[PDB]
């Protein structure tokens, strides 16, 4: 009896100086079949924090529910909402609590920090985490990471002036890298959900992808 | 339950304009043997919810009694509040995941069909605790055979009628009887609308064997 | 996996009237690097190059046996071998050991003799030919390479534009792989020249 | 992972690489393998990223609580002993961590190595990780107890550089720390690519 | 093992073989597989001898106590539900194939099937054991609605006899039981009384 | 992989997808799965790609040699026997499940050969990982003695069912119509999938990549 | 674990190896020779399987010596390293594959000094310096940091000492003595053993 | 798979299902299991499809050549002996359950059984396949000596129909064959023509 | 492999042990101490499992030191060796059994010197001399042939050298330094380390 199931799905996260984009595909699968074509992996935690998970859907559904409850309990005793950094630090301890029967989930929290600048936290299945600028996790994480490194991090480029990451240029980048991941990865496809975390709230955009 | 005993095959499910229709053959298989050919694999939770489970039949009977008590318990209070199709689906997802986390799951794959507050709900819960919603569902071998047919009708006609969805369910049941080696030609058809949950059958399909002569 | 024992990655791209073939130079046993100038790309005849990835011992064996066959073929029917003919030759060699195959995924790239039409292809361990129109990757970091080429490759690039694309794809693909890197060698095959330069990569 | 530590005449030098891997794939290249327990306590990490991170953070919380009750900073020997007893409970359960506790308490500079297996020894020069074997070569060769601060920084940087050149699981940058009597200080964080251009 | 239970208007008819084998050896050649759970409630045991005896004793205890508190003849469905509970609870530890069949004032003659997993299903007739596989086609082609208490006894004897010849784990004598409102009537069928079928010969 | 075939009024219609995966990654989005055995006989192949090619290439050369000797048109039985006998001799180690269809003197015949060596002569068949999806379309809309255009539409729907429901199949749809007087190899027949248009350019301007060494060589 | 090492200079190759033969926990020999003289300017260092090393090194040697007899001239270091690599690679998928790691050192008149590294999977690789065994991990970094292409013979031996001294204090095995040789234009020269 | 062969005065009657399953999926729902070895000699195949087809082709070749040299209709026992030889020779490599049945001028209508191991035994009627386990009791209680060519066709159709309902590996249509001195007569029984038995219901 | 050794004389016990702490193929420490001072005249030498040795030796030590505090007098060598044997034997069939081999040396005022040998299965045995590890096989025979019951302290140290010298030339492991101690009526005395 296997308690885990690979359901696929990729989640992206890019942090700006005033925003934070968290995108993911909406295809749930198993083996070679497609469960549903409409299953986004992005969840709105607070008003400035969005979590994205991929992997075993059973654990994603449970982890997300636990995080929702932990946020409510924290607001009851501390009388204030939990910050992005506090939600990342708390997730680490929750993932490591099941260290000998871990959640098969790849989480990528994206929001805004105290200052007001975009924040992105990448997590590992057992709980390890760190804050970065951009991050890709899922079944196409290895296909997208290198592109973001080159395009956003300006790695391996000798003659570039390194222009600031604007919200309009990052919106195209997320759409572009996911259109390339749907051409190679068989777990990525059908629809792309994009959540933009700004100071005026969380916006949501949906773009179609390949269905084959 | 590490190893299932008497199991059931695929359960179909498709949402239509004003309700949800669910089909399931009435057969309890013991390996490759058709042991029980008259068992109902569809249960009516309450007035707006119905359930169709595939897999271990003993687990389905345990869930049938654990759900029946819940509905009865809630009706005793009579405060107006009642479990919706979405609330039952949620409860089942937590029950399936909890069992799976304790290394002792209920070998089943359910299809929850309901109709409350003007919305048709079609849920799906497996033994690992994996759950989602969709316009049309199919478990067991129906995901490889019936799912493709249901999805090919909902792509050009997203909204279906009661008669259209029912005619599509019969076509899928007939295709499952030709290719699934663990299915029977005797099935039940449950429908949940504004009037409630109604079960019909046993029904049969119109199988043709012209290809046997060629 | 046996293929991930020595690491390495080969890439072939197509341009207007040119082809490019790049490869990593790190030779190493598992986690330890031995030399940083291992040859993974071999010349099969002026405008025809073959890049091999996988087990280093099978990379040298397959390159030597293919050369042995290629020499006899060119002497017999006194003419230059055609890119498509070499693929069939290589595929046939790999399929002889169908149940005890060589651990190497070849990547052929070159211009057709006389017509000078670009040609790139890749084969699996048992010799399964796959002729494409854009690019072909082979190595321990194909996923990373697949993502780079998919969003960088353009339909009709020139020699200079093609060199920049294949170099940026390899440099960013081998930086995500641990057992791949330590220098990158690129060969740009044109109609009258064969430019070969080693890119400045990370020595990690 | 490649982390080294050695105590010379002017305190303790701590250096580490910044690269996480998920098999052949390079997960990250900006991971901080050196965690600060407090102003006079440093802790290195090698092995299980989640294992070392959670247990060193647990040790840091224990050291802060200890200082509130006894109204004094914990020693380097007590800090390592605490951590050693923590991981011993889960011995032979899968825990993977090779830390190095460094600090300057009452008996001068102290450097202890503590792994998940059960080891807990003190020394003058340690090296944990998959690239530790390569780091040892350069370390010992250039190690001297009367090394100057500038010469000690060079040795630690050069030792991590050569280890990342030979080991595939070590790379990124080279974070260097210097523990003194007044407390540890962040010396530098040179990138391996820039070190390669300087050593060539 | 080859147990069988059929029902008629009045009540039900039970039947079983009597062979208990431990490998290729018959440890008990006259085993009594039909176990009385109550006055008008019996049960055919199949599977593990130790598991079926333990469960039958437990159910008999629980049913007896339950019937003394309610001051009424126990329902056949109640006995079957008790069996089902233990069969499902300890499904990973027990190996039983109980067939509960009896007669009560409410529903009359009933036959319940409680297979290995622990599921409970009511049928007009049920067959269990290792030798029941060979008579699946026979019971489906011979059973007819409206059988009397006399035809049911001949139907059960015929099916059990056919399973005893093909199965190595089934044999010995045949223990029948006809439960009605009047009471229970046991009957054994030995050598000459056991239905015989001419073996095809050239 | 989704390969299928049917037998219509006066001919055979073969179809297949064009996606080739190397695990859960698309290696080739336009590979040919319909192989030529002879002028009147074609073959759709799934299973092990390398074995599917080598087995069909060998049988096609054997059928070509046989055709030159006899001087007549090859039969579908001959191709079936050769394949099934060779496949059986390797004891299933040659993973090659193909759909053999052609038209000879006896008429149009469609066979399905499995890796172990078993064959089946049916009016319609489906192979591959998306075989159950294509079979559902054939078991819901197939009618005997269909028109050429009707058979092409029904076989296109079968390949489309597999392409959109199976993760191992995608890209385009390949068709192959073999009749008593013609052989129409339509590749591609239908393109249900198309890469999305770029939202921005990522061109690598010259001089963006540093170079440590450089050596040019002038070829004749 | 046995230890081999090679250092190629401007016009010479410096090779060294441990001379310890051991069975289970005891050292049976403290003056064992792991170097095989293939020719007048070619040395084949071999380590690995108990019986495979000698069987393989002697077969190659026999053929290399046979080559000179019938031809009148010796095989070059490159050709000798390719011949041995081809023979080890042929047995790899055979009935009896030799599990041996080796280093080939030689000096070609029109090519200078050559140092070849080979593992047990028959993967040939020319290198400026190399090592085999569990002690290679500890000494490869020392080499890297101190080795320069124009290194002189005197400094090559001084550099060798450093690597062997590192093994003395860091390695868990007992390697007290090492065999040292040098190949240049005047053939192979025996150098004083480095003992500790 | 459910194959069956019975014999009467004139010749023999064959029968089989048509389902070919690869797991829980029916790859071929109209398989022809009855294979002609010669003019008046047929054979029912069961077990592995690839193994039974390979052997049948080989035997058909050997029997055809043998019959052309002897210039006489081949004996049914000769065909069965050939099958037995290959079945025994490669018993560790093949998985077949062939039933050779035909008619010859010497012995008339004969039915031979060649099970997995490779043994050969002549019977008046034989059943094979995975679905033959459920009809063992039915054939033993229904078979009677003296059946005509018409009763044999109804006997085979009845037994095959009963096995198709209980077995998951058996189903589809029913392919019959009546071989006499006059020749062979094939016949298929589809949906409505397939014998039906009222399923016990409450 | 770690090495322990004990030699009991007429009125003294001589114990020695290697001071090498090692991880995989490298020696992390060359001055490690494997001796635990249980009391004023009791030494507990411990080797074995990585984490078990210290955990077990410190637990015994704590209890032996506790015994003296509450009672005013120390535990005898025999009682201390029986207490440790009883504790190791209780964990043997428990959830977490310590895999440690040890030697207990002590001097009792009314009983003289005592040398106890204990394996990981908690089997106590008094002996005139003993050893632990893979080096015990090579040195136990030397002891047997040269050890006499009336051996003097000076000859006991000379005899110890012979055993350690045998390890230097025969053992495959690297044990260059050894810790030496002696227990008599004046307590425990630190002897100069024997280095090679
Ligand atoms: B080091 O390489 O040891 C490094 C030290 C950490 C970052 C403090 N460890 C890792 O890189 C690392 C790798 N992993 C897992 C390996 C198996 C798959 C999941 C990740 N954890 N830490
Ligand atoms: B039957 O064959 O299934 C039968 C049913 C029982 C009698 C209720 N079972 C057995 O034959 C049987 C035999 N045993 C034991 C095996 C070990 C030795 C003691 C008998 N258990 N069930
Ligand atoms: B029967 O069920 O025993 C039947 C008899 C055959 C048709 C003579 N066997 C099968 O059903 C069967 C199926 N297969 C293969 C399994 C692998 C895929 C191809 C078919 N082999 N025998």
């Amino acid at each position: 009896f296997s308690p885990y199931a690979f359901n696929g799905g990729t989640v992206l996260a890019i942090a700006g100086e005033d925003f934070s984009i968290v995108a993911s595909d909406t295809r749930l699968s198993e083996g070679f079949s497609i469960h549903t074509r409409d299953s986004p992996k992005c969840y709105k935690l607070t008003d400035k924090t969005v979590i994205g998970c991929s992997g075993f859907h059973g654990d994603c559904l449970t982890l997300t529910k636990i995080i929702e409850a932990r946020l409510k309990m924290y607001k009851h005793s501390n009388n204030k909402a939990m910050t992005t950094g506090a939600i990342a630090a708390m997730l680490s301890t929750i993932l490591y609590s099941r260290r000998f029967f871990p959640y098969y989930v790849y989480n990528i929290i994206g929001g805004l920090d105290e200052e007001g600048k975009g924040a992105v936290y990448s997590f590992d299945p057992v709980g390890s985490y760190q804050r970065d600028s951009f991050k890709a996790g899922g079944s196409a994480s290895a296909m997208l990471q290198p592109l973001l490194d080159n395009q956003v991090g300006f790695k391996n480029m000798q003659n570039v002036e390194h222009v600031p990451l604007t919200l309009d240029r990052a919106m195209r980048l997320v759409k572009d890298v996911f259109i390339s991941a749907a051409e190679r990865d068989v777990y990525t496809g059908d629809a792309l959900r994009i959540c933009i975390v700004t100071k005026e709230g969380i916006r949501e955009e949906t773009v179609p992808l390949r269905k084959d | 339950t590490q190893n299932p005993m008497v199991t059931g095959t695929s359960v179909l499910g498709v949402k239509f304009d004003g309700g949800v229709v669910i089909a399931a053959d009435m057969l309890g298989s013991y390996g490759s043997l058709a042991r029980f050919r008259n068992i109902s694999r569809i249960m009516r939770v309450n007035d707006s919810t119905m359930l169709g489970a595939s897999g271990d039949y003993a687990d389905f009977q345990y869930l049938k009694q654990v759900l029946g008590q819940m509905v009865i318990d809630e009706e005793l209070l009579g405060d107006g509040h009642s479990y919706s199709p979405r609330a039952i689906h949620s409860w089942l997802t937590r029950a399936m995941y909890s069992r799976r986390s304790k290394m002792n799951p209920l070998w089943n794959t359910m299809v929850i069909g309901g109709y409350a507050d003007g919305e048709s709900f079609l849920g799906y819960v497996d033994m690992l605790g994996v759950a989602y919603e969709a316009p049309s569902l199919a478990t067991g071998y129906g995901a490889y055979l019936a799912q493709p047919l249901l999805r090919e009708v909902l792509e050009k006609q997203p909204v279906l009628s009661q008669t259209e969805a029912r005619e599509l369910v019969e076509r899928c049941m007939r295709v499952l009887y030709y290719r699934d080696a663990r299915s029977y030609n005797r099935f039940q058809i449950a429908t949940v609308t504004e009037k409630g949950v109604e079960i019909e059958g046993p029904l049969s399909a119109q199988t043709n064997w012209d290809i046997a002569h060629m | 996996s046996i293929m991930s024992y020595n690491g390495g990655a080969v890439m072939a791209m197509k341009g207007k009237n040119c082809v490019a073939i790049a490869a990593d130079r790190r030779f190493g046993i598992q986690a330890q690097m031995v030399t940083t100038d291992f040859q993974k790309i071999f010349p099969m005849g002026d405008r025809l190059y073959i890049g091999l990835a996988g087990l280093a011992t099978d990379v040298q064996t397959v390159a030597q046996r293919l050369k042995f066959r290629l020499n006899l073929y060119e002497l017999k029917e006194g003419r230059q071998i055609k890119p498509y003919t070499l693929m069939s030759m290589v595929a046939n060699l790999l399929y002889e050991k169908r149940f005890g195959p060589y651990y190497t995924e070849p990547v052929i790239a070159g211009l057709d003799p006389k017509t000078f039409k670009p040609f790139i292809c890749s084969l699996d361990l048992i010799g399964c030919p796959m002729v494409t129109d854009d690019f072909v990757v082979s190595g321990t970091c194909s996923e990373q390479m697949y993502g780079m080429c998919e969003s960088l490759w353009e339909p009709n690039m020139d020699p200079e534009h093609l060199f920049e694309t294949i170099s940026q794809a390899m440099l960013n693909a081998v930086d995500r792989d641990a057992v791949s890197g330590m220098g990158v060698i690129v060969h740009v095959i044109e109609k009258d020249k064969i430019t070969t330069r080693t890119l400045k990569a990370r020595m990690d | 992972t490649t982390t080294l530590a050695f105590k010379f005449l002017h305190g303790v030098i701590v250096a580490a690489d910044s690269r996480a891997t998920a098999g052949a794939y390079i997960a990250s290249q900006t991971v901080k393998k050196v965690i600060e327990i407090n102003p006079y306590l440093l802790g290195t990490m090698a092995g299980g990223a989640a294992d070392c991170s959670f247990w060193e953070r647990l040790l840091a919380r224990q050291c802060r609580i200890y200082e509130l009750r006894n109204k004094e900073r914990i020693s380097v020997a007590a800090a390592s002993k605490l951590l050693a007893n923590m991981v011993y409970q889960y011995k032979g359960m899968g825990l993977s961590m090779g830390t190095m506790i460094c600090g300057w308490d009452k008996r001068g500079p102290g450097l202890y190595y503590v792994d998940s297996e059960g080891n807990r020894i003190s020394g003058t020069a340690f090296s944990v990780g998959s690239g530790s074997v390569y780091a040892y070569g350069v370390m010992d060769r250039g190690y001297s107890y009367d090394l100057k601060v500038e010469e000690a920084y060079d040795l630690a940087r050069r030792a991590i550089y050569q280890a990342t050149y030979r080991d595939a699981y070590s790379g990124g940058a080279v974070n260097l720390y210097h523990v003194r009597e007044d407390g540890w200080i962040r010396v530098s964080s040179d990138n391996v690519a820039d070190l390669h251009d300087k050593y060539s | 093992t080859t147990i069988m239970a059929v029902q008629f208007n009045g009540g039900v008819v039970l039947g079983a073989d009597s062979r208990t084998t431990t490998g290729s050896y018959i440890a008990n050649r006259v085993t009594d597989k039909l176990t009385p759970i109550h006055d008008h409630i019996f049960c055919c045991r199949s599977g593990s001898a130790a598991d079926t005896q333990a469960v039958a004793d437990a159910v008999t205890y629980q049913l007896g106590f339950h019937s003394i508190e309610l001051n009424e003849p126990p329902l056949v469905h109640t006995a079957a539900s008790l069996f089902k509970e233990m069969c499902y609870r300890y499904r990973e530890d027990l190996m039983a194939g109980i067939i509960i069949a009896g007669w009560d004032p409410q529903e009359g003659g009933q036959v319940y099937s409680v297979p290995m997993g622990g599921m409970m299903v009511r049928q007009s007739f049920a067959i269990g054991g290792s030798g029941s596989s060979y008579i699946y086609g026979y019971v489906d082609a011979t059973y007819r609605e409206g059988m009397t208490k006399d035809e049911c006894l001949q139907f059960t004897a015929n099916a059990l006899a056919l399973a005893m010849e093909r199965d190595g784990s089934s044999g010995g004598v045949i223990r029948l039981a006809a439960i009605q409102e009047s009471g229970v009537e046991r009957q054994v069928l030995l050598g000459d009384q056991i239905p015989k079928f001419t073996i095809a010969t050239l | 992989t989704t390969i299928a075939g049917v037998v219509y009024k006066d001919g055979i219609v073969l179809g297949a997808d064009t996606r080739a995966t190397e695990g859960m990654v698309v290696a080739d989005k336009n590979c040919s799965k319909i192989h030529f055995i002879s002028p009147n006989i074609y073959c759709c192949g799934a299973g092990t790609a390398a074995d599917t090619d080598m087995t069909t290439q060998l049988i096609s050369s054997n059928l070509e040699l046989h055709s030159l000797t006899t001087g007549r048109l090859p039969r579908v039985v001959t191709a079936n026997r050769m394949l099934k006998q060779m496949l059986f001799r390797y004891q299933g180690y040659i993973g090659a499940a193909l759909v053999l269809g052609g038209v000879d003197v006896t008429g149009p015949h469609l066979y399905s050969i499995y890796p172990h060596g078993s064959t089946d002569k049916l009016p319609y068949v489906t192979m591959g990982s998306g075989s159950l999806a294509a079979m559902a379309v054939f078991e819901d809309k197939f009618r005997p003695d269909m028109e050429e255009e009707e058979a092409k539409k029904l076989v296109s729907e079968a390949i489309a069912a597999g392409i959109f429901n199976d993760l191992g199949s995608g890209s385009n749809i390949d068709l192959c119509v073999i009749s008593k007087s013609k052989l129409d190899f339509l590749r591609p027949f239908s393109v249900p999938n198309k890469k999305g248009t770029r939202l921005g350019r990522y061109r690598c301007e010259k001089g963006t990549t540093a170079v440590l060494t450089e050596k040019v060589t002038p070829l004749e | 674990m046995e230890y081999l090492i090679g250092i190629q200079g401007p016009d010479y190759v410096l090779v060294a190896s441990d001379r310890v033969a051991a069975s289970n926990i005891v050292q049976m020999k403290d003056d064992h020779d792991k170097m095989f003289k293939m020719s007048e300017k070619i040395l084949l260092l071999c380590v690995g399987e108990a019986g495979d090393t000698v069987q393989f090194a002697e077969y190659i040697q026999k053929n290399v010596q046979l080559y000179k007899m019938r031809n009148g001239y010796e095989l070059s270091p490159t050709a000798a390293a390719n011949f041995t690599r081809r023979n080890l690679a042929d047995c790899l998928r055979s009935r009896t594959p030799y599990h041996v790691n080796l280093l080939l050192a030689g000096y070609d008149e029109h090519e200078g000094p050559a140092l070849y590294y080979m593992d047990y999977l028959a993967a040939l690789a020319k290198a400026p310096f190399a090592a085999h065994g569990y002690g290679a991990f500890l000494t490869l970094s020392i080499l890297d940091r101190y080795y320069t292409p124009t290194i002189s013979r005197e400094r090559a031996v001084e550099l060798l000492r450093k690597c062997l001294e590192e093994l003395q204090k860091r390695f868990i095995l007992n390697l007290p003595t090492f065999s040292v040789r040098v190949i240049d234009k005047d053939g192979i020269h025996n150098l004083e053993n480095i003992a500790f």
Side-chain angles (χ1 to χ4, degrees), chain A residues 54-208:
Chain A
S54 26
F56 178 41
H57 198 230
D59 278 335
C60 290
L61 284 174
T62 320
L63 196 37
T64 268
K65 274 196 200 246
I66 287 161
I67 295 167
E68 269 161 17
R70 279 302 284 285
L71 287 173
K72 214 161 244 163
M73 313 179 203
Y74 171 108
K75 177 140 108 186
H76 281 332
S77 32
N78 293 79
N79 292 289
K80 66 147 160 340
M82 219 181 307
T83 62
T84 318
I87 288 161
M90 177 211 57
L91 179 61
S92 223
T93 72
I94 294 167
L95 286 167
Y96 197 88
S97 72
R98 271 250 226 120
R99 161 61 159 93
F100 307 113
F101 194 0
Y103 295 98
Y104 190 40
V105 200
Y106 287 115
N107 309 291
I108 284 189
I109 296 172
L112 296 166
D113 57 49
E114 274 323 64
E115 285 112 46
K117 345 237 198 90
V120 157
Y121 293 91
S122 29
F123 289 75
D124 92 331
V126 255
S128 184
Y129 83 110
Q130 83 165 296
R131 190 224 185 110
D132 29 48
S133 303
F134 43 100
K135 204 43 197 239
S139 33
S141 154
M143 238 172 268
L144 311 171
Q145 247 313 130
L147 198 258
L148 295 172
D149 280 343
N150 184 241
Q151 282 323 304
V152 177
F154 305 122
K155 315 249 157 132
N156 299 291
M157 285 164 146
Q158 245 216 167
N159 296 325
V160 189
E161 66 310 278
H162 304 191
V163 61
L165 215 219
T166 192
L167 178 47
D168 189 305
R169 140 156 239 256
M171 270 312 272
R172 267 138 54 202
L173 192 61
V174 176
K175 289 189 213 221
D176 281 349
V177 301
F178 263 95
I179 273 164
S180 299
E183 287 284 303
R184 293 302 167 165
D185 181 40
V186 308
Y187 291 120
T188 298
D190 78 50
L192 164 71
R193 163 84 42 91
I194 299 226
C195 305
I196 307 84
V197 168
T198 40
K199 72 195 145 65
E200 322 99 45
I202 304 179
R203 202 168 96 242
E204 279 190 330
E205 220 149 338
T206 285
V207 119

Side-chain angles (χ1 to χ4, degrees), chain B:
Chain B
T1 302
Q2 299 293 335
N3 354 78
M5 300 288 141
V6 181
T7 57
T9 21
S10 29
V11 169
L12 299 198
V14 32
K15 269 146 71 164
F16 64 82
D17 197 58
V20 174
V21 61
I22 282 184
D25 89 333
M26 343 180 47
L27 166 72
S29 264
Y30 194 31
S32 62
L33 161 84
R35 253 249 240 191
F36 315 97
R37 296 109 102 242
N38 206 31
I39 58 167
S40 204
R41 283 164 56 217
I42 290 156
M43 78 152 297
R44 146 175 177 316
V45 177
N46 54 32
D47 270 299
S48 61
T49 324
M50 59 185 174
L51 199 139
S54 91
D56 192 50
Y57 191 66
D59 280 327
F60 168 66
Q61 269 187 334
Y62 161 80
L63 274 183
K64 210 156 99 206
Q65 80 136 71
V66 163
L67 249 190
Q69 197 39 69
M70 275 185 48
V71 165
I72 282 169
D73 269 351
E74 212 213 13
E75 270 159 12
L76 293 188
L77 318 163
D79 34 52
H81 294 278
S82 140
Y83 286 130
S84 73
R86 180 166 270 104
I88 301 292
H89 181 248
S90 190
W91 177 92
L92 254 185
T93 312
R94 243 89 279 322
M96 292 300 257
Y97 184 84
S98 247
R99 282 285 295 250
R100 158 261 176 220
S101 298
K102 269 174 352 103
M103 285 312 269
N104 176 214
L106 293 138
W107 218 273
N108 276 113
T109 313
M110 268 87 39
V111 152
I112 308 219
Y115 189 79
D117 317 331
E119 308 258 36
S120 50
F121 168 93
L122 197 61
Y124 162 111
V125 194
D126 80 341
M127 78 163 145
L128 284 195
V130 171
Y132 60 84
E133 298 172 22
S136 86
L137 291 162
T139 58
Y141 256 65
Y144 312 111
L145 291 150
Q147 190 58 114
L149 287 177
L150 301 175
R151 264 195 206 125
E152 146 238 324
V153 158
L154 298 167
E155 245 300 20
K156 41 189 348 129
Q157 160 128 247
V159 172
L160 271 175
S161 26
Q162 231 232 93
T163 283
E164 233 108 46
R166 150 82 84 124
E167 257 141 32
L168 172 57
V169 147
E170 253 110 71
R171 265 167 56 201
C172 276
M173 285 314 283
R174 171 215 261 115
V175 170
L176 284 170
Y177 182 64
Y178 282 163
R179 298 298 159 161
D180 188 13
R182 248 45 141 207
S183 67
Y184 209 54
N185 205 10
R186 171 200 214 76
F187 60 90
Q188 274 184 129
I189 284 267
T191 289
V192 67
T193 48
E194 225 173 335
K195 323 160 105 148
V197 171
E198 150 115 40
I199 320 211
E200 304 261 27
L203 310 164
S204 277
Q206 228 73 124
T207 28
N208 172 245
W209 304 83
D210 267 7
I211 44 158
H213 274 326
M214 40 173 120

Side-chain angles (χ1 to χ4, degrees), chain E residues 1 19-22 31 33 45-49 52 169:
Chain E
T1 284
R19 148 152 345 162
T20 299
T21 29
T22 73
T31 299
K33 278 144 201 205
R45 291 173 306 110
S46 110
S48 161
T52 47
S169 329

Side-chain angles (χ1 to χ4, degrees), chain F residues 89-160:
Chain F
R89 173 195 244 183
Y90 277 97
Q91 277 296 290
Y93 284 111
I94 284 216
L98 8 110
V99 167
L100 196 75
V103 172
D104 41 48
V105 275
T106 334
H109 309 279
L110 185 76
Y111 295 85
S112 65
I113 299 87
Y114 289 84
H116 282 309
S118 29
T119 69
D120 286 285
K121 211 181 139 307
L122 306 140
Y124 52 96
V125 300
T126 48
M127 303 253 184
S129 64
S131 143
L132 300 232
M135 191 27 91
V137 174
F138 279 163
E139 290 287 19
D140 170 81
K141 296 126 137 181
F142 173 93
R143 310 165 18 251
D145 295 356
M146 263 172 346
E147 284 323 63
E148 205 239 352
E149 294 299 320
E150 265 155 57
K152 271 167 70 125
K153 193 175 167 183
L154 159 93
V155 163
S156 258
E157 275 182 322
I159 298 308

Side-chain angles (χ1 to χ4, degrees), chain G residues 58-76:
Chain G
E58 258 155 18
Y59 169 78
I60 292 303
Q61 180 176 231
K62 187 244 210 192
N63 289 284
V64 174
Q65 259 151 27
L66 180 61
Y67 187 99
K68 170 194 200 36
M69 280 306 321
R70 51 168 57 143
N71 292 138
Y73 50 77
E74 313 176 311
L75 251 184
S76 77

Side-chain angles (χ1 to χ4, degrees), chain F residues 65-109:
Chain F
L65 238 193
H66 187 253
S67 202
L68 276 168
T69 302
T70 64
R72 320 151 138 85
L73 212 61
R75 283 159 202 239
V76 197
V77 234
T78 307
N80 180 64
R81 278 243 175 189
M82 284 179 176
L83 284 172
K84 123 210 263 213
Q85 262 164 19
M86 175 202 189
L87 275 180
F88 178 84
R89 173 195 244 183
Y90 277 97
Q91 277 296 290
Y93 284 111
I94 284 216
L98 8 110
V99 167
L100 196 75
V103 172
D104 41 48
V105 275
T106 334
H109 309 279

